[PDB]
């Protein structure tokens, strides 16, 4: 919304680039009229064979006459003509270098200065400036938005003020040869316009209904892949797979009305745009036949009318990039043209010498960008004497810290005033009162250069002396010596990552060369090993004793020494003094003291979509028609022009041209009819593989083992959208790219015939020509994507320069040297520099080579079209017909490429379509094999289970695992922590086999045991019971499936998990729906529900899975009171955390490290004491 002033966006084009752009959109402007002309005199042409047409024809009597003036007026006249485009190609080769270079040598001189200005700009903000905003947007600003003034200021304006050219002078060669037909064109705009709106309110009407439409089915698959466990431990695989496969049958439906009505709309655009034509074109027939004007004449009008109307069009894109280069220049001049009132780059205030280094801070108020949040400094006074080293201590706030933000002038105060020396400290030099502050800050950061160059950040001009001498001093000599490479080592997040007190004392080498007169130590100390802390301490201890020196840390240790220390308490100044001082006032330090101490062949998609061997057949067969059905509308207009210039007597001509206008609308109505079937076939044949393939993936994904699930490259997020994205591509590269693809083969195919059994030596003329242009404008576009990719790999270079400097920001003006990362991201951009001017160069070039292959082509078309084909019997009827039909057939092949990415994306979503259904699990539900055992009553063995999960094979869960429990008994499971309490559940449910020893049931093996049964037999509760969307009823008889279950019955469960009261309470009673989209209740509800499905089954195993976990008072109570109700008359493993209602348990069993460890009743475990009797007494008393 926000724009620029274009003048104010030019502002950094002066002298030459104001040339430029006058010169480039000068030849902008010539490059754009050529066009018309180019058609102006393919009308004289016309009445040059017109005039001869007519009389050669008007003969019928002598032969050898019509050999002497016909051609004499042909070679002439064609010369004359042919000399002209050969002209006008020169020209156009010219200007379009000229169109393209300059616009881009303006644009890249400009966008250099930019960048230069704008990065600039970002360094010279003050910090305050910074606190307000996030660097990561403005470094993104920088590198996006100088790109889109790049993109507005470069060669699309040139080819705006091209396609206005070709706009202004279309209509103008319109006017000035006929006033009509123009207004007659504007007639029938408004009707393509019309048509053409009708699809912008079809297909956004549309694309959200299928968005819509799948989004009913995709929210069944999503409810169902989060409860997979769940539908997997109740077997509702066959009902979750038939209920998403009852919305595709909608989404089928929905999908071939959209494809009836959406092609009924192409069909009718097009019937509408191409009648609209041939009325104009029909009634520019009936103005001839009047002697009004000339068959040339109307060509040149009603092809200089439709290009300068279509390049309204080819206009519009350059206007809107215009535009976004403007928006986008708005926040970058905000940058460049705002004005900080602190600088740095300012030369400007005092310089003293001599600097003794009395600080003194009076009345100082303060408070950070928050502003009036939070005011952190309510008044203050505190002096420094010269040479002493003040030490600053602090509950909390970190007023501390603001001080030294002050004492650096990062903010000006809101009242008071830092003063050094006596002066106050806005007099002095911004950069020169940081270069005679030294600092060394909590964090320590080194930029990616060599341990020199971060000392040589201190200063520029040093020598590996001083630098020798600094690390020395700082005692980081004798550690860096031992690393390899000496001085010349690497620094950054990128490599030889050190230690952090080895990283202080080359910040405080780097701070050492500074000479500084001021010291400021902010948390130096602080966070920081305690063995290295001592070494960091003592160049600390030696950086001092030759400066003042302000110190802030919450290490007791260093501020002994310190001949004042100062304490904060709510921003006001309250203690100071030497520390046996304020030991004896007995307030805020003494306290803080004693506180402290693969793209692939893959035919068998296409074998699957075989299951329609029809509706391919009926849309190829008629997509062929319609290909040859369209270079005959090229034929008709071919001979509506030649039997009206090889006209001769003029009475039969008014009667054969109402003949052709008819049929064309026959021709264009059977070419409706055909459209209307190739894209319904492949419309519904796409639709209904759509759903065999969700059908059949859908199928294939419940059908992997928990194992598969788990994996975190499986989410359900991730398994919808991998649903819905292969199909749908698939869909696209066996739909519409497929039926165009043929009919345009068919197109140029009939078109190719027509036009070569037309013209002798002429096709082969143009096949010479066409796959060369075609060639030539593919290559072009190669060098594009070429010099594209390079000029982004070395500007990412210069805004990589450009990310350390900015968001390492406040480090570097404390150390100022901004003026280094203002050079070095100069020197980096002379390279793209130095590279977009070849750019201009490379574009001109390529772009003016292959306009004049279009007209050196286009001279070479009626060249060899008249003269030697022409002085001999071939005719100028079918010269025309030879364009239109193989330039039509040509474009019509220029859609190949376009529906190129539409196969390669399909494809590779193909090639994961057809791994996920060939994917088989190691436990599949599916098999029918098993025994099926016939006796009821349930024991189960655990024997030395040793368990892995597949997705974490590093610490094992279970090892050793060995359990027993008889029917009719609870058996109680307590572990000091992690599924080892669980993973016995889902070993029983048989979500895993485990890698050694086996678990058993009624005395056989499950793993030989029959999948699906085994699950039959398990009442399953977790602790988190997902309830899908529908009746309560139903969520009730989910528990039971191959069975349809009395409502009795499931009364019955409802009787006994105790949820009954609920059931009536409600006014749908159990019908109503449940899941967060009907109505919503809490958790207690949820889980009786689940006790009910639970034992709807009539299980003689429950499996109670912390099912009291989340869950709270009374619900606790009512909850237990349900499940206790449910056990002791099956088989019964409970891991709940509640030990207190654990105690009525038949055998109770301590897991450590996945073995068994202790296991006996309660008092049995009472009796004993251990690990039981600490899990029973640690939340008995808490
Ligand atoms: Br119908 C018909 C279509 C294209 C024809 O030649 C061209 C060609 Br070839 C290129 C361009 Br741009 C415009 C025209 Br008009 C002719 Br002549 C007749």
Redesign the pocket.
């Known amino acids: 919304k926000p724009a620029v002033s274009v003048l104010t966006m030019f502002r950094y084009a002066g002298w030459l680039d104001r040339l430029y752009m006058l010169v480039g959109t000068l030849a902008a402007i010539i490059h754009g009229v050529a066009?018309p002309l180019?058609?102006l005199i393919?009308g004289d042409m016309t009445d040059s064979f017109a005039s001869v047409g007519q009389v050669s024809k008007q003969s019928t009597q002598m032969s050898e006459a019509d050999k002497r003036a016909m051609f004499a007026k042909l070679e002439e006249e064609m010369t004359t003509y042919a000399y002209y485009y050969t002209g006008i190609g020169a020209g156009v080769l010219i200007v379009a270098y000229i169109q393209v270079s300059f616009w881009c040598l303006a644009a890249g001189r400009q966008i250099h200065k930019i960048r230069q200005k704008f990065f600039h700009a970002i360094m010279n903000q003050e910090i305050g400036w910074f606190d307000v905003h996030d660097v990561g947007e403005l470094n993104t600003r920088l590198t996006d938005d100088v790109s889109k003034i790049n993109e507005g200021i470069g060669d699309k304006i040139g080819m705006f003020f091209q396609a206005m050219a070709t706009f202004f002078g279309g209509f103008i060669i319109g006017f000035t040869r006929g006033w009509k037909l123009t207004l007659v064109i504007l007639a029938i705009s408004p009707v393509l316009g019309l048509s053409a709106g009708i699809w912008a309110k079809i297909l956004s009407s549309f694309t959200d209904k299928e968005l819509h439409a799948y989004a009913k089915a995709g929210a069944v698959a999503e409810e169902v892949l989060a409860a997979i466990r769940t539908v997997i431990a109740f077997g509702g695989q066959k009902k979750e797979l038939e209920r998403y496969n009852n919305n595709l049958e909608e989404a089928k439906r929905l999908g071939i009305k959209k494809a009836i009505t959406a092609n009924i709309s192409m069909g009718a655009a097009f019937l509408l745009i191409y009648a609209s034509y041939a009325l104009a074109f029909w009634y520019g027939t009936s103005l001839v036949i009047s002697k009004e004007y000339s068959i040339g004449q109307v060509l040149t009008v009603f092809?200089s009318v439709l290009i300068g109307a279509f390049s309204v069009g080819q206009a519009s894109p350059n206007i809107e990039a215009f535009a976004n280069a403007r928006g986008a220049a708005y926040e970058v001049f905000k940058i460049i043209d705002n004005k900080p009132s602190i600088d740095s780059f300012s030369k400007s205030g005092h310089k003293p010498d001599n600097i003794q280094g009395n600080l003194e801070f009076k009345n100082i108020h303060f408070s950070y960008p928050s502003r009036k949040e939070v005011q952190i400094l309510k008044g203050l006074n505190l002096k420094v004497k010269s040479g002493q080293t003040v030490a600053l201590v602090g509950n909390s706030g970190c007023g501390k810290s603001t001080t030294v933000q002050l004492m650096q002038r990062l903010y000006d105060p809101l009242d008071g005033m830092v003063s050094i020396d006596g002066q106050d400290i806005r007099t002095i030099n911004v950069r020169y009162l940081r270069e005679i502050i030294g600092v060394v800050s909590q964090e320590p950061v080194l930029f990616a250069t060599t341990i020199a160059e971060n000392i040589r950040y201190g200063r520029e001009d040093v020598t590996m002396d001083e630098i020798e001498k600094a690390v020395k001093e700082a005692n980081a000599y004798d550690f860096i010596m031992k690393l390899p490479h000496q001085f010349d080592t690497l620094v950054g997040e990128r490599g030889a990552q050190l230690s952090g007190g080895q990283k202080q004392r080359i910040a405080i080498a780097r701070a050492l060369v500074r000479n500084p007169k001021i010291l400021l130590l902010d948390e130096a100390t602080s966070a920081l090993d305690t063995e290295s802390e001592a070494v960091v301490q003592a160049a600390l201890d030696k950086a001092r004793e030759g400066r003042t020196t302000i110190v802030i840390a919450h290490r007791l240790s260093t501020v002994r020494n310190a001949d004042v220390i100062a304490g904060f308490d709510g921003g006001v100044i309250v203690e100071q003094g030497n520390h046996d001082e304020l030991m004896r006032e007995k307030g805020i330090y003494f306290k803080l003291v004693m506180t402290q101490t693969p793209p692939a062949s893959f035919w068998r998609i296409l074998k699957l979509n075989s299951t329609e061997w029809p509706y391919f057949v009926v849309g190829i067969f008629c997509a062929i028609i319609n290909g040859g059905l369209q270079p005959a509308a090229?034929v008709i207009?071919?001979k509506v022009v030649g039997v009206f210039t090889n006209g001769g007597p003029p009475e039969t001509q008014r009667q054969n041209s109402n003949l052709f206008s008819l049929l064309f609308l026959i021709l264009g109505i059977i070419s409706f009819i055909t459209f209307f079937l190739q894209g319904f076939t492949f419309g519904k044949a796409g639709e209904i593989l759509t759903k065999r393939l969700r059908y059949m993936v859908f199928k294939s994904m419940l059908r992997q083992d928990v194992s598969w699930f788990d994996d975190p490259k499986n989410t359900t997020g991730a398994l919808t959208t991998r649903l819905a994205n292969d199909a749908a591509q698939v869909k696209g590269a066996t739909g519409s790219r497929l039926a165009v693809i043929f009919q345009n083969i068919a197109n140029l195919g009939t078109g190719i015939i027509i036009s070569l059994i037309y013209g002798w030596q002429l096709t082969l003329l143009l096949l010479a020509i066409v796959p060369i242009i075609a060639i030539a404008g593919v290559v072009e576009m190669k060098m594009l994507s070429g010099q594209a990719l390079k000029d982004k790999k070395e500007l990412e270079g210069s805004g990589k320069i450009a990310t350390e400097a900015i968001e390492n920001f406040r480090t570097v003006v404390s150390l100022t040297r901004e003026q280094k990362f203002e050079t070095m991201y100069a020197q980096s951009l002379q390279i793209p520099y130095r590279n977009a001017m070849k750019k201009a160069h490379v574009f001109g070039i390529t772009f003016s080579f292959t306009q004049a292959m279009?007209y050196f082509?286009?001279a070479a078309?009626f060249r060899f079209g008249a003269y030697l084909v022409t002085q001999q019997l071939m005719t100028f009827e079918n010269v025309?017909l030879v364009?239109?039909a193989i330039?039509?057939g040509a474009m019509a092949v220029g859609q190949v490429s376009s529906f190129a990415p539409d196969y390669a994306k399909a494809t590779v979503s193909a090639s994961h379509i057809i791994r996920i259904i060939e994917k088989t699990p190691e436990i599949d539900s599916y098999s029918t094999q098993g025994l099926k055992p016939n006796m009821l009553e349930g024991n189960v063995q655990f024997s030395g289970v040793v368990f892995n999960y597949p997705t974490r094979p590093s610490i094992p869960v279970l090892q050793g695992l060995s359990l027993e429990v008889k029917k009719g008994q609870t058996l109680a499971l307590v572990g000091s922590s992690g599924c080892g309490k669980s993973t016995v559940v889902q070993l029983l449910e048989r979500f895993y086999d485990p890698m050694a020893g086996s678990v058993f049931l009624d005395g056989k093996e499950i793993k030989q045991l029959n999948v699906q049964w085994l699950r039959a037999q398990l009442g399953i509760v977790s602790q988190e019971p997902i309830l899908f969307d529908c009746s309560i009823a139903e969520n009730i008889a989910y528990g039971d499936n191959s069975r349809v279950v009395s409502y009795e019955e499931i009364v019955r469960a409802a009787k006994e998990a105790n949820i009954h009261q609920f059931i009536d309470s409600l006014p749908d009673k159990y019908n109503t729906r449940v899941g967060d989209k009907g109505t919503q209740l809490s958790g207690g509800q949820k889980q009786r529900i689940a006790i009910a499905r639970a034992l709807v089954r009539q299980p003689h195993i429950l499996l109670l899975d912390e099912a009291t976990s989340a869950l709270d008072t009374e619900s606790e109570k009512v909850v237990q009171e349900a499940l206790d109700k449910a056990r002791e008359g099956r088989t019964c493993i409970v891991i709940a955390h509640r030990l207190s209602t654990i105690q009525n348990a038949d055998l109770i069993v301590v897991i450590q490290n996945g073995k068994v460890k202790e296991h006996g009743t309660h008092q049995q475990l009472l009796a004993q004491k251990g690990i039981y009797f600490s899990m029973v007494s640690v939340q008995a008393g808490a």
């Open positions: 066009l180019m058609m393919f092809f090229s207009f071919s279009m082509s286009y078309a025309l364009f239109s330039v039509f």
